[PDB]
Symmetry: D2
Subunit: 329 residues, 4 copies
């Protein structure tokens, strides 16, 4: 049982030994992701784990996989769009994926950003950098249990946000289109308008769909409380960035924590020069009441381990024609 | 019922009218701290609420409060250092204070700082500032339910830190010299050495005393885990700053969140020029794995209100010959 | 939109008005469940909600449903075995069901029974009934945070058990065959032997399968700690009752809370004479360290509401050829 | 180091050896309470630990402890009623006690009883006893996150009740005459009338004083919701038992859990005959929606140990001229 691993990250490499032992298999790590140019390297292998940078679009790959007895495409991510299903069907190559990495990883980054912004630590730092070490009333804070949290969408990640906040004593409201009895201990469902008007901290947990692009814009910011804090660890495209920047500069909201931004593809996950960084990011990055992280909410030891292990399990099951949890086909 | 209030903060001013209505009393605000210069303004006053900047040394102030029928001194703060208790006894002046502003205010600042540093948000920022938007392993994080929290001292604040951390699923250990059965659902008592050795996040909750000054020094940093996060929202002098800086520079700890620092008195609560700010602060402030705040863990609406309303309440009571909750030796 | 409701319970009747308003439909409640004998009563109706006592086995029902334009069978329960799918397929009659009622309802009954049995309130009552009002050491208890909980199986219900207990400070271990990252904050996975040897309170959350019938028997009881408490709110058939009774009489365990028993079908949900109640139940019912409830863990306002509302939603969607959440076909 | 222990419980006996090892002292156990009859057994003793059944009236006991160099009286209990404090001062005998055994022990008994009664387990039992195994609406229950908890008094115990209930998602309200900022994450202060009117579960945490005797009477039952559950694990005399019985009989409340009852002193902690048990108890004990326990909320391993080790520790300290934590007036 030798499984090829394409496009391993530094963090995934640290796990290979442990992983090999636990699964009784060998991992063959290959530095680039899978192309026509290096597929010839699964020959001595019984399966493939993928982290595709770019679309898997040219058929010499899909065919040559089947030539070697490969039956499955084990994506180490949720993201499916990089796989041309037409081809996969064409070579009885199942696709697996990793739908849930660690919902607490993302929930905890959201809560963390919200707390820091609530305590205005950045605004204190910007004051201090100018030699102002006072406690002006404009930097006063409050305990989390005096806050209302509002969730737009819930899911596994929102549910974990609600659990955390409600356990610190906060009131958590949520708009959603589906009803889940299991999250009732931790939040109260309410319609969208109420969530936006009443919440002191608002966090996005909606999927990106054409109906949700820009669902947070000028009109929503105007509805928000002026001291509200917006967090978006879901999808950059949910929020109109210019509307956001302006709302922050107008003080129609108080702060924002973003793990994701529209057009992040140009720069997130890369090294770049100054001329490569867009101007909206530079504006947000200069504000003491804004956090931007490079889509790293997921980035814990647990998520990294699960991405590797979940995908590997499905992928070995399928090598043994055994059944698999996260087929997508 | 009229109560003089000396030296109110800006945040304190803002609550005044609501407090009048709530207590059905009148608050006479004096901008400065009580002094021989302003004492005669107490003349039409039932009681006094003090926030002394500096020593209340002169005796004619005390003679004159006693002359005006004033039966106590209501410290709005915790520290009684500037009260010459000798003169107090001489003039039959009970002294009260506010020991417990809001333990949650402080505990939440500690947690917030720990979570931010755990997520290495500032290290991602320093990296992004140089155009690096990747997710290197050196910035991988972890879920809080995988961490051990170590408390040095508990008290009302540490106890609250322990409640919050254990409610997120963390394991919490605490060193203390008195036993409180009511904290055991949230922490496990342990030896001081065990705590430093096993904790991934250390938070300080120890009174500053002769015996506890530089309690956290070179030897203690050497004992901690190298990815440990040190939080001090108790008292700066508990920590040897030089040893802290060195430890961080050598990566013998991963991060530090300080709401208080040795020698902070020179610059905390002031506006100053660059030349007035000490070098140890400047070193800390430059580190992207450090947070420093200007002793603002307390600074929530609840605290500021409690500082007024708890003193006011004991102060009114003693004016009525009734009992105060927080009389002091 | 008129929906027939068969075999309504007293609790479901209390909801009709509210339900009708919220869904803009009329409910036609019919006292017995659906047979050949009363199916002629869906004529003026656009759908049917069912709570079948007994198998729906005779085709005159399935055919006459289609004759009236009925497209769906809306079960108000999880239980599917009462529907002959061969027939349903034969009349393009979809089957819906209600998979999740309220997991907290069942989790809370489990926790409640565990707590009462931990505090030995029944044993105190049996003492008191004989005139003994003392506090003998054999009736000493302990705080929940000094206990280890062990879950055999997890699921939605076990996950809610773990959440509750771990929030009171208990250590929760769990054996399961599937791995769910989202419950990690609340329990630690461990193998079956460890859960049985180490747990102070053990609660069953395994599905009944031929491989699980009697999975708790003489050998497991002997492995359990002598002061352990077994709770089973899952499926009566998971536990060998005679092995249980004997373990209780031998004091190889301390107590048991059962919401379900093998052969409960003879008596649960019915009114019966003494000669109709089996002897195993009478033995357990006479023990002060045993609770038996008549499979009522589910029985809250929320579960009753959800059973009605979830099934009704799917069933109206299907009347409008719209899509539905809980199809089983 | 030898410390005499008077009148140990059976549970206390069981810990003795471990306590010796833990304190590195010797414990001389005397079966009876201190009296002129047994005082001379203190002669070889450093200090004393008392559990007085009855008044310690004679003065020669006190003269003789003082004669034997004994510097304090270590009550292992909370109540100091049987200490003639006058004689204590005469003979320079500091008096200490144990105010805080384990607040969680008591709070957990309250919660446990509330949850059992909320789930109406005893009413299902009374029903099953008559062969009725149904789920009538009169026995429908509800999830604890849908309930409001009302506390009359807080303190260390009530506070713990509030932590547990709010961690299950309940809304908790409390009436009190002193403000504690540290409880606000878990409860909201409210007027006494609001609490009785809005609470679905009422739990008492008020000291028995002249002004609080029958604080819960006819008028207060009439104010409560008719499906209210009343819990008293504080002091029996707070509740007018006649009015309690009547209220239950009239279904003006749904249930009651009592760990303490007015006049309990006649039978609690004793073995007695049927003729010695009062009628009000017999009425309560017959109701399947009532629990009565014999003042055993405290009775966990933690409490029994703390009662020994906390007194022992202050007792050793005062023998060393060091400070005690729980000296008493």
């Amino acid at each position: 049982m030798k499984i090829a691993v394409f496009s391993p990250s530094e963090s995934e490499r640290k796990l290979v030994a442990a992983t090999e032992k636990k699964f009784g298999c060998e991992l063959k790590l290959i530095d680039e992701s899978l192309s026509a140019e290096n597929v010839d390297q699964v020959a001595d292998c019984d399966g493939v784990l993928l982290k595709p940078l770019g679309n898997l679009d040219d058929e010499i790959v899909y065919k040559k996989l089947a030539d070697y007895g490969i039956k499955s495409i084990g994506l180490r991510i949720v993201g499916t769009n990089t796989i041309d299903f037409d081809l996969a069907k064409k070579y009885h190559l199942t696709v697996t994926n990793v739908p849930v990495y660690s919902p607490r990883a993302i929930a905890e980054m959201a809560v963390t950003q919200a707390m820091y912004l609530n305590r205005k630590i950045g605004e204190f730092k910007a004051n201090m950098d100018k030699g102002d070490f006072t406690n002006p009333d404009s930097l006063i804070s409050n305990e989390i249990y005096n806050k209302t949290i509002g969730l737009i969408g819930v899911g596994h990640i929102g549910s974990a946000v609600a659990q955390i906040f409600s356990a610190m004593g906060a009131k958590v409201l949520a708009y959603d289109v589906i009803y889940n009895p299991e999250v009732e201990p931790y939040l109260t469902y309410a319609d969208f308008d109420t969530v936006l008007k009443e919440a002191d901290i608002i966090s996005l947990h909606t999927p990106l769909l054409k109906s949700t692009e820009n669902m947070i814009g000028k009109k929503q910011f105007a509805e928000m409380k002026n001291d509200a804090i917006l967090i978006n660890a879901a999808r950059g495209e949910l929020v109109d960035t210019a509307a956001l920047i302006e709302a922050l500069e107008k003080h129609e909201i108080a702060a924002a924590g973003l793990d994701t931004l529209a057009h992040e593809s140009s720069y997130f996950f890369k090294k770049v020069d100054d001329a490569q960084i867009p101007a909206d990011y530079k504006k947000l990055a200069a504000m003491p009441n804004v956090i931007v992280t490079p889509h790293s909410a997921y980035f814990t030891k647990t998520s990294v381990r699960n991405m590797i292990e979940i995908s590997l399990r499905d992928t070995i099951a399928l090598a043994n024609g055994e059944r698999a949890h996260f087929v997508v086909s």
